[PDB]
Amino acid sequence: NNRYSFIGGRTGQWQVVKIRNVLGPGLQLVEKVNILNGASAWRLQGFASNIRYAIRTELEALQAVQPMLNRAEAILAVLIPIKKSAQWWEMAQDERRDIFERESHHTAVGLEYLPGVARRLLHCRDLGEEFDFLTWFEFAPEHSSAFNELLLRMRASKEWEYVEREVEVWLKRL
């Protein structure tokens, strides 16, 4: 099933460490997040989809180093819902690819954080959700500082001038 739901509330596989309401309306602090592969204070949902930007040589680079989810060591996670602006979504494909990679170097920068950080990308604009993306990251604690670095590098990029809502939900695996 390609649908995932993230329930913030009193039960789940993940303990909430902190929530940082980076930009726009936040998410209510809760005890735990329950993650369901299918369709409480809030529910987020999104789907796994096909590649939108990455080119073949980028995928090869990613495939050579990216880790799998569910490593025994990867006891920390971060769920980061993201919303991009109307101006982003009205751009053509070349315009969006150019900002994503040529200007902002998204994949190249993220590659610097592999193999330490595992990730999953979910899409949800097309479900009518209040966010556009649910991004998921997991890693061992030794990579927390580097992941915090990466977040600030991304926020400095051209791509991020089109981000209108962002929240960080920091989790620890129970």
**156 labeled part of a ligand binding site:** no
158 near a second copy, judged by CB under 8 A? no
Site string for a second copy, 45-84 (x = CB under 8 A): --x-xxxxxxxx-xx-------------------------
Least Å from the CB of residue 123 to a second copy: 7
CA separation for the pair 73, 76 (Å, rounded):
9
Question: Exposed, middle or buried: residue 18 (CB in 10 Å: 0-12, 13-18, 19+)?
Answer: exposed
111 near a second copy, judged by CB under 8 A? no
∠83-160-120 over CA atoms, to 5°?
Answer: 60
Half-sphere exposure of 28 (CA within 13 A, CB side): 11
**Which residue from 20, 32, 43, 97 is in contact with a second copy, where contact means CB under 8 A?**
97
Least Å from the CB of residue 94 to a second copy: 4
Instruction: Identify what 133 binds: ligand HEM, a second copy, F ion, none; CB under 5 to 8 Å per kind.
Output: ligand HEM
Any alpha helices (H) in 12-114, and if so which ranges?
56-65, 86-90, 93-97, 106-111
